[PDB]
Amino acid sequence: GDELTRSHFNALYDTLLESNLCKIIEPFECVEISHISKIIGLDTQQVEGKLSQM
Amino acid sequence: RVPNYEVSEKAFLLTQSKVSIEQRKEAAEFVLAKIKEEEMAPYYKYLCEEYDQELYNELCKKNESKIKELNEKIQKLEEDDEGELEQAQAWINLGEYYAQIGDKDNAEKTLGKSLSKAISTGAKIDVMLTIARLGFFYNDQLYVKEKLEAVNSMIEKGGDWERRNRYKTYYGIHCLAVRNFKEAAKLLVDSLATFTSIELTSYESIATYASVTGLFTLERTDLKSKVIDSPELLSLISTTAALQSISSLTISLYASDYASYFPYLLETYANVLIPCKYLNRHADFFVREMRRKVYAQLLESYKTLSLKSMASAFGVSVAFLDNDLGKFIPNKQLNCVIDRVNGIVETNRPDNKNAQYHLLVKQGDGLLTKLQKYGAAVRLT
């Protein structure tokens, strides 16, 4: 209903996507990628590409 | 104004045998046009070696007309008595008539008087600018350097922001010609925004140059900010093939797409590097740098890859990848070892205090050396 809010919410998706991942792997070292994948709730391969970018 | 730079750009094409026959002869027409029109006969002589009697008559005429004209004009401008205004102007004009026909020698003498004889600091800078352009013309770089070293002294003396800009853009081109790209980039990005062209190349040329350097030197984060999100580039889109190719390469480098990176590598070579005069000589050097850089980029994020994965990604065979990695490994930039028995690509990263220790000793040997010799000299004397 708010065209301005909607636009800025795709962006929000993306900067928050980061926020969730960082928190999960912060205590661990040598964490399985399968473990990450379940929590975030996004497919195995998709995650590899994001992480490599980060 | 337009021929002063443009002639050299076309002429360069002609020289080269790299260029396609279609392009070579497209340029040939362009050159011949401007000879007759600007009456370049002295200089034309220089270029012909590197490449009708009516032309010659055109010289002989135009010369004696232009000579007789200016002669008595100048003679009268000196006679009637005030030097601040008339004598100074008259020498400017004299240099300009030499610069049109490209006699270097007689211009050094005339524009030299103008500098010596007291005038506004503005006035000094402006005049020097022409001498530097003739150096760039001649395709001698060291001639440009001596002049522009003086120009730089006067820049903060005068304090015009107008000429700080113009100075930046000349020095920008000089540096594009030498290997050193680091200084070129800094100057080059600012000048996308600002520079009314003066006796130097069009803004389309200047645009492709900022994109090219940006790849080479810039850190990743900073390529994105300054270049992709450039207000200038985005509005300018692509109205040229050269600008299009370089843009396509930038988008895959940042996006970590690798399949399309290699088609794109090939494209920029054809449509950017060879047309551009200054970057032609660095054609080999650039593609080397870029190929190290991409391989590097991917290896930074992976502790390991398998050979099949990496090769399919870039789009080359596994055999083609292996021969190429091993070029760049002893020169140290990719920082990776390769197992053959298990097919694996390990990536060692041992850079730490060790890296920095080697840089300091090597450069150190050199400071010691210089010092010893200057010491000995003076002691004798």
């Binding site: - | 080999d284 050097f285 593609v287 080397r288 740098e289 789009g315 080359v316 065979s317 083609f320 004798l380």
Partner: protein, 51 residues
């Protein structure tokens, strides 16, 4: 005269003209690698595709 001493002593190793005897007698290396690569990338592609 310190300088003059240098040049004279040196001369016997230089003899007649160790300067002009020799000429009277007689990434920058690597070739155009674009071409090699062009062809490699298409030769890979072909097989990839028809497989």
């Amino acid at each position: 005269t310190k300088k003059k001493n240098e040049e004279i002593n040196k001369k016997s190793l230089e003899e007649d003209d160790e300067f002009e005897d020799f000429p009277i007698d007689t990434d920058d290396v690597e070739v155009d690698d674009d071409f090699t690569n062009e062809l490699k990338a298409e030769l890979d592609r072909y097989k990839r595709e028809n497989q």
